[PDB]
Design a protein around this ligand. Structure first.
Ligand SMILES: [Mg+2]
Ligand SMILES: [Mg+2]
Ligand SMILES: [Mg+2]
Lengths: 114, 99, 49, 144, 139
RNA sequence: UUGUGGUAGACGAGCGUUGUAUUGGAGUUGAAGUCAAAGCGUGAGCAUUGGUGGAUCCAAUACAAGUGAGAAUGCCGGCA
RNA sequence: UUCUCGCAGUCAGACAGUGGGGGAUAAGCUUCAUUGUCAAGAGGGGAAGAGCCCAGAUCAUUAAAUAAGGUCCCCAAAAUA
RNA sequence: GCGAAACAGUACCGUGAGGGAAAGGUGAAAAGAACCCAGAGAUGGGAGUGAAAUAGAUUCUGAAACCAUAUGCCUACAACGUGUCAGAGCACAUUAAUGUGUGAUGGCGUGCGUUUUGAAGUAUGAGCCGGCGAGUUAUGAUAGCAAGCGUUAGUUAACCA
């Protein structure tokens, strides 16, 4: 018994090529390059799915530092004024968003002054 | 007006009539769930949590997020393992918040 | 006993196919190691040796 | 999952400024200028929209460098040729070209980036008190 | 309302025919026949005849207006090739490949004629989604 | 409750292909194959609709193998 | 990690700390005993580094506290004396 | 699959012994496309036959690499293993989905197999696509698992019907 099987190979390569669309040049045409680029893209996806929560926290810190620097104290002093006194688990983003709807944030920053 | 609520493990800034997506809650469509934990309801800041304060939401749907197809591949060392993931979520909106 | 569904109890064991990729294991080297005398065709010198 | 963080986009509004760099020092002025240009101090800093303000620096030649640097630290500039090192000293930079000094000291503090070359053009360093940018109605603040 | 005309396996290159086909495309027919006759190219004596034949096909067969015509869309697709051997120093026998071109010229009558192709494109997906939806009634 | 990085390498459970057997069954009211699409799976892989095409084919359980390709200055054909 | 049975693979190692030989208290040198790491191992520090320091990745989260290292700007984070 | 489905040991290479290929399918049936227009003509476009002429003699189907055309979006101060995570504006509207195509701009980012102590590698292999292509078989040995049969057990080979 002889088995040729050109169906399965083409279907597999078609899936790999379909994965990489919107790629420059031949990367979406030739399969040999498409597989390399899909592998590399998924590596980058795995690394960035961690780097982005590494970075968004930093952005929230930055936009909280800026808001507090216009009241007379720094972010590195505000965190004490949440943990030790008036123990609060308000998150590190929402205290950021509260500036985009301000004058409810000022209530926070003057509440810890007690 | 606003409120800050701990649903799942993420804290949410939530007003009236807003739809937000949280992690799976094990509750069928249409029922009302009272999220219990809450901090900073309205100018009223509970230090550990705001006691005797809830936010009442109606669950809209259970869904699966977009597929994340993770392939990990040691370079030039005989390894091409592949795995896929569809994190389930629940979308739900608020009706009003218990004072 | 319904030849349309004929089943045994247990005899169909893991067939180590040696050269069909890595996911099954036993792939490119095929269990022969790396680059020795045994790696080449017809290794395994005389039994008592 | 969670509520997506808010991020302004083409919602930028930028107000001019004026600082009279009479007796400040180079670097302490430069970090403040760099932050004011980047809009790092804005309450809503979107990292990719040039949300920062404009800036005009006046009386450049009066800025001061601490210590004996005026005779010991050199600024270099090289053409792509050979033997093209142009090497000038702090005393000569505070006289011949002073605005270029503050300009360069500010530019290097910005990231290697594609808005950095578009940020830096928001810094206008006039050498003397007079200017032609009174039309834009700047504010005025001390030591920034 | 297109009335094309095609010549197959002309002994010209595809890449030399595309140079004058660019000249003729998008322009009116009165300033195409003459502008193509007057240019000094081998790829012009081979396209003047074809363009005039397309004119005649449009005018006689389909019955269009004529002085409203314009060259809708011009190409020189790759026709079949010929393979030949060429001697060399020391007998190395490179392969010369003679080219060819399947020229085709389309002559439209209404000035737009392009949104109609897009309309057919959109219908071909509208019917796909519609057949998809009518088969969602599997309950 | 304790765990879940991993080459060589040991072990386990599996997908797919071609055909035979019996069992069901779809097909000119359009079969396989082929492209396209904004689906479903933990993976190998699997459906749905439409255009083309113009006669064979799909699922369940066993069985048997020329059974699974990105690399061999690989072979053949085509094309840059 | 002891005993029996089936099945292999391996026998070109490298560097850092420590104690010595050869070497010239020369080598990213060579040969050993030892502790690690890499190999076969990603992340953070180190500007950039396979082998140093911290650590040991089931997958998703636009959650919180930390280790080495670090807080004028690039680059997240500090002030007083 | 015989080297060979056809005028193959042909054509072709070689002084000679000898070496030695490739390619098939209209349709049910030629009803092989009279006639008209352009053109020198092949041919093409209508007509005509026919179920279909995107079946037309280039003749079953007709992927990919490859070459051209076109709606939609971006790009002419920009350092780029070319993608990813964020993200504007723009244009559409689906296997109804926290949707689709492009993606100004920020952060981040030295390919795949091989062999090596260690390679992005100034070490090597691959121009690209498709197809072909590499642990099987006979007869015995030992081990594991399952089954039949069992304590004077078990078991056939050749051969014959
Ligand atoms: Mg090898
Ligand atoms: Mg391989
Ligand atoms: Mg070489």
């Amino acid at each position: 018994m002889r088995i040729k099987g050109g169906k399965q190979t083409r279907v597999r390569r078609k899936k790999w090529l379909k994965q990489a669309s919107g790629s420059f040049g031949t990367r979406h045409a030739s399969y040999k390059v498409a597989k390399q680029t899909v592998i590399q893209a998924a590596k980058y996806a795995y690394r960035d799915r961690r780097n982005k929560k590494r970075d968004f926290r930093s952005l929230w810190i930055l936009r909280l530092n800026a808001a507090l620097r216009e009241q007379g104290m720094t972010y590195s002093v505000f965190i004490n004024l949440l943990k030790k006194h008036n123990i609060e688990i308000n998150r590190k983003v929402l205290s950021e968003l509260a500036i985009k709807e301000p004058s409810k944030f000022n209530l926070i920053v003057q509440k810890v002054k007690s | 007006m606003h409120a800050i609520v701990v649903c799942g493990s993420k804290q949410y800034l939530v007003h009236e009539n807003d739809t937000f997506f949280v992690e799976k809650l094990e509750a069928p469509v249409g029922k009302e769930i009272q999220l219990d934990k809450v901090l900073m309801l309205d100018e009223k800041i509970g230090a550990p949590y705001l006691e005797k304060a809830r936010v009442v939401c109606v669950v809209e749907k259970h869904g699966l997020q977009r597929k994340v197809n993770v392939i990990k591949h040691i370079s030039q060392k005989h390894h091409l393992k592949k795995y896929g993931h569809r994190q389930p979520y629940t979308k739900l909106k608020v009706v009003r918040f218990v004072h | 006993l319904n030849q349309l569904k004929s089943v045994p109890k247990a005899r169909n064991h893991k067939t180590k196919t040696l050269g069909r990729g890595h996911g099954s294991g036993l792939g490119k080297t095929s269990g022969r190691g790396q680059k020795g005398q045994k790696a080449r065709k017809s290794g395994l010198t005389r039994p008592g040796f | 999952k969670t509520s997506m963080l808010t991020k302004e986009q083409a919602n930028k509004r930028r107000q001019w400024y004026i600082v009279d760099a009479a007796g400040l020092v180079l670097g302490k002025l430069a970090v403040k200028a760099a932050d004011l240009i980047r809009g790092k101090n804005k309450v809503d800093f979107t990292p990719n929209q040039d949300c920062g303000d404009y800036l005009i620096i006046i009386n450049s030649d009066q800025v001061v460098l601490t210590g004996n640097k005026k005779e010991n630290e050199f600024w270099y500039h090289h053409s792509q040729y050979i033997g093209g090192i142009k090497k000038v000293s702090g005393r000569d930079m505070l006289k011949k070209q002073s605005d270029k000094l503050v300009y360069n000291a500010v530019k290097g503090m910005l990231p290697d980036n594609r808005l950095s070359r578009r940020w830096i053009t928001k810094v206008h360093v006039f050498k003397g008190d007079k200017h032609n940018m009174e039309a834009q109605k700047p504010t005025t603040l001390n030591w920034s | 309302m297109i009335a094309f005309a095609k010549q197959f396996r002309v002994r010209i290159s595809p890449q030399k025919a595309r140079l004058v086909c660019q000249l003729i495309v998008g322009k009116k027919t009165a300033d195409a026949q003459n502008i193509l006759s007057n240019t000094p190219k081998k790829a012009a004596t081979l396209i003047a005849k074809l363009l005039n034949s397309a004119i005649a096909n449009a005018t006689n067969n389909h019955g269009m207006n004529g002085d409203a015509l314009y060259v809708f869309e011009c190409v020189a697709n790759q026709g079949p090739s010929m393979k030949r051997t060429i001697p060399r120093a020391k007998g190395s026998s490179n392969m010369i490949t003679k080219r060819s071109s399947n020229l085709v010229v389309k002559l439209s009558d209404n000035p737009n004629e392009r949104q109609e192709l897009i309309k057919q494109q959109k219908a071909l997906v509208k019917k796909r989604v519609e057949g998809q939806q009518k088969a969602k009634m599997a309950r």
